[PDB]
Structure formats: structure tokens, C-alpha cells
Amino acid sequence: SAKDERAREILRGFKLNWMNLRDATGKILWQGTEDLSVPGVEHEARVPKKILKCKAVSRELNFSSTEQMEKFRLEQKVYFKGQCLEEWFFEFGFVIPNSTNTWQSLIEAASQMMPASVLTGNVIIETKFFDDDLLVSTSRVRLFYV
Numbered sequence: 001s002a003k004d005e006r007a008r009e010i011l012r013g014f015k016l017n018w019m020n021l022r023d024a025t026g027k028i029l030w031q032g033t034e035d036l037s038v039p040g041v042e043h044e045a046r047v048p049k050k051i052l053k054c055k056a057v058s059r060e061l062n063f064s065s066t067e068q069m070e071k072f073r074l075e076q077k078v079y080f081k082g083q084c085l086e087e088w089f090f091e092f093g094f095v096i097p098n099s100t101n102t103w104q105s106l107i108e109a110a111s112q113m114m115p116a117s118v119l120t121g122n123v124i125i126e127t128k129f130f131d132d133d134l135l136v137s138t139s140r141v142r143l144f145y146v
């Protein structure tokens, strides 16, 4: 199919170079250079348990893309033992072909949170990579709170 092939081109030319998370203070809480967007494998991350007590977290995402995108955006879900507890939407917008970009996002928490000791290893963050309405990939990170 025609859309399938375009999605595979975009995936092929895409790379997450690095990321970090700060208290919205700022204070780096987590950082990494592993490309967590790679689909098909379950990635793992260890975050400080005190992140659960932040009102907001500031994220920085550095990525490269050989393909042009008209509307790059993410849909991200927290899954707890298979169950979706919370969802976020983030839009970056237009991406220049063969560009490298730094993206800043403010992530806010919504209800009361289970303890870190209950959550740890039982939380999966699922990220869906879209160009407008075309799904380019799905990736997963399992979280441990340390």
C-alpha cells in the first residue's frame, strides 16, 4: 500500500539522538543517548522515584529526520499492568528534510498516584509516532522507579 511505504521511508530516515527530563527545577532528573524510539524491542529506563511527586516535568528531545514531515506529533500512554491510566498529545509540526531539531515539551500530571514501589516495573510508556494522521511507528519503554 502507498501510505505504508511512506511510513517506512520516514521511519528509516528518523533518529532520536538524545533526551532529558527536568523538574518544571529545572534540575535534570533523567537523561539518555539510547534511541528509545526504536520499535519492536522493549526499552528500559530507571527514573528517580521522586519524579512521581513533580507537578510538571520539562522534556527535551533531539532528533534527526531525512524525510520532510508536515505535522510530526506524538501520542503517549501510561499503561499499568496492561491498562491505560493516562494519555498525552504533543505536536511538533513541520520538519525540514535532513534537519536536526531540539523539541521542548511541558508534561503535566493529572487524580492521585500509586506509590513508586507498586508502579515499578509495572508501567509501560507507549509512544505512537505520527505524521498528521499517518502512523509511522509504535515504541515502548518499561519504567523502574529507583
Ligand SMILES: COc1ccc(CSc2nnc(CC(C)C)n2Cc2ccccc2)cc1
Binding pocket: 016, 030, 036, 037, 045, 047, 059, 061, 074, 076, 088, 107, 125, 127, 128, 129, 139, 141
Ligand atoms: C518518535 O518520536 C519519539 C520521541 C521520543 C521517544 C522517547 S519515549 C518518551 N518520551 N517522553 C517520555 C516521558 C513521558 C511520560 C511522555 N518518554 C518515555 C520515557 C520515560 C522516562 C525515561 C525515558 C523515556 C519515542 C519516540
